[PDB]
Amino acid sequence: MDRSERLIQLISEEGIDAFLIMNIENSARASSVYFSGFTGSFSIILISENTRLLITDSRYTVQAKQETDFEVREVDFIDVLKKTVNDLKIKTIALEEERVSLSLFRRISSAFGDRKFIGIDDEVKQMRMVKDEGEIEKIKQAIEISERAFLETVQQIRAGMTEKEIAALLEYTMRKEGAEGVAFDTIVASGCRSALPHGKASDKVVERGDVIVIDFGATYENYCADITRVVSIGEPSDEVKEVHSIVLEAQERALKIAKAGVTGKLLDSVAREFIREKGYGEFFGHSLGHGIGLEVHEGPAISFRNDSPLPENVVFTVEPGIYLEGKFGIRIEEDVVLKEQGCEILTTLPRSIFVV
Amino acid sequence: DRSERLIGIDAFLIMNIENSARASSVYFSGFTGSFSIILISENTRLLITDSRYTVQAKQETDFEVREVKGGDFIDVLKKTVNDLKIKTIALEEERVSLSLFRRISSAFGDRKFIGIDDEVKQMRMVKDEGEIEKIKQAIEISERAFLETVQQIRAGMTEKEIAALLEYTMRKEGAEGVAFDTIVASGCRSALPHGKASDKVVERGDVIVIDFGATYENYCADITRVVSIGEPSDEVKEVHSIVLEAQERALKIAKAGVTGKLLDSVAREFIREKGYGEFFGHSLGHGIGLEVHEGPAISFRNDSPLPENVVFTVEPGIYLEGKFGIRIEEDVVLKEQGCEILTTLPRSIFVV
Ligand SMILES: [Cl-]
């Protein structure tokens, strides 16, 4: 399926003839998926009234015909695309100028010298930021898959395994539960590595006593989950327990004020204020969260710098973190949907430390 | 080093945002994170990032690490270019969005920009020993996982199940990830040069082409081997023999100075003489490195003499529509008097 219909409605309202997506090496993967249903890394998509064209190479010709109801052409795509643009008398073309390189844009500009280009990045971003109930359903499914897999994987964790072996098991188990991919490189940060906010599962061997931050998420029907929980090999120290309690309380304070109209800045501020008055401000994470959907990193940004009022049905994460350099770190993350007078938490896993 | 080798341009600017310029960030600084604004000049090696990566960046690079603790990173960057009196800036304009270029243009105001994409690609095309070691490791992980996976293949499994098992095994064997989605094409689907893993069930007698590759420390492997549940037919054995002999003909003459055009031609000619010219692939190989597809292209169109230490694949194939296909792929490093084959897996059909 695809949402090309609402896109057509969008450009037609402004008299724009067509929308061009240039997905090369996944440069516009999410847009390609959202507007055509194609999940591949290469796709040149042209959408206009009564026109749905998708140009891709031999690696994806069959796939594109399976995933979309577009007219698929196999192919250097500029000359091929221009033929259609001219045959359909398309004069104005909308583009996502944040998703086209300067060099490619100059190539397109030179080839289409008699055309007018219109950046619609803001409109497309707003379109994707507010999820339909169908999308929220898919995100929830991805979360359900992720959580079931986590529960089956967590007790199998033990000293001697490498962080990558743990990540491997979790990812394969998500596939067992229905995941059709992984949303991002699973993070399994053990011991001192747990103090690194966003590293990745490494060859480091997990040791007894290790605090382990696990950030994971499956994809299902193209939508993503993003969950973070903490595991401890053996009973955690009182200090670890205390930092964990502060993180949990900070998260809950942000969740209590989340409602339509709130800004990412305000949400971030309540967690930030709570943590710093406890004396841990210098160890607080960079931002409180981010949006999710077709991607693990999309709007809205739940940070100190985002003062934009958030409308209902945006989907984002709430994940305060406290990292003590050279010692350990703690981060707990929920996925939520903003609603008119509060929010809807989609994650359900216990937030307590999983002691194994 | 690379930054020095790259060094009337005053500085080179890499703007890695949400991994938008990850390859270059990794190549020039060693940093593996998603956010890094790098400035390189004769007297400056600066990496700007935020608290998500400060400690990591200091562990991974010898660059001065600057953390943006407030405002927009563009303002810090602007402050830096002005303090350093940088007037002409080099960019990989294939790796900077139109919108981002507008933002820096307005911020720097007067600066002149020059694209150096071709020069950077030329640098990455010739690998140093450290890179080859990483590629070798990605290959070793890939091969160990392959041997463990083939012994678990069961008639009745789908191509996707085999692909998933192989990827899981690579991950547990140390892979950072996969270079590309594992391809498992069985039976008539093996005759599809680009046929991807599907729900098709693998049966006894099916030719199973498996194209896979793990990534290790950001470098990629790209291997293709053939598996068969039970002894393969005499025809499959014959076609496989021809593909292998064609591959050997190309590998035999591969050395610094040779052209991809000749390598492709010798493999193609052999296949044609054997009566399969109409079923030959389109290209003989492609380069590998921080990405699965990079220079040099081992095709009829590339007549440029290949220098020592380029790293590429040699993968001839014969595809018989409706029947089966055979492809065997090696990863090699070009040397002065020959080539170093990095892939060690036997090229014979793996009968399980
Ligand atoms: Cl409230």
Ligand SMILES: [Cl-]
């Ligand atoms: Cl603060």
Ligand SMILES: [Cl-]
């Ligand atoms: Cl509602």
Ligand SMILES: [Cl-]
């Ligand atoms: Cl310019």
Ligand code: NA
């Ligand atoms: Na289960």
Ligand code: NA
């Ligand atoms: Na509330």
Ligand code: NA
């Ligand atoms: Na360092």
Ligand SMILES: [Zn+2]
């Ligand atoms: Zn996260």
